[PDB]
Amino acid sequence: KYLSLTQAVLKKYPNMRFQDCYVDGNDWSKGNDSYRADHPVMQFVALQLRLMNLGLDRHAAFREAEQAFYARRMQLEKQQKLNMAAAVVAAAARDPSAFSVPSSSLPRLTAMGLGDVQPLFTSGQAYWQFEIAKSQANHLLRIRSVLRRMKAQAEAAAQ
């Protein structure tokens, strides 16, 4: 029954194929869609079939599995938020002022999620755009640093 349950869940949520995309065993090419027993698709269909055996309809089991894995997603998201909260202080320890007002924006960048701990998304589109934004920001940072270095050199030459 997994042959059809996996097709249904994939058609509803195509983004599940990203997970473990580089791990041998998950064949996501068209015409196969055969994932490892530890893949999210396999876990979803296993839970759905377990509920069906317990005596629910296919659609009811689908909804129950969806709720269960949404709850799991929420748990992992809160764990990531706790890690980001820890990283906020870890980076704030780097401020010379702490060693009145903060003398850097790194804690705020970490809070926004651009610091040491980065957020988790549900789709690969989000990671694509996140990486593009990161590259653009880093190029702008290089330009700004060079401009300020030239500023300092000009000031020193003038003085």
Binding site: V89, A90, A92, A93, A98, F99
Partner: peptide, 22 residues
């Protein structure tokens, strides 16, 4: 033989100050 002690002293200071700040 001196770089290790210097680095671990820096780590000690950083850990102590982070714990105090927290």
């Amino acid at each position: 033989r001196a770089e290790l002690v210097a680095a671990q002293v820096r780590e000690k200071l950083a850990i102590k100050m982070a714990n105090a700040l927290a």
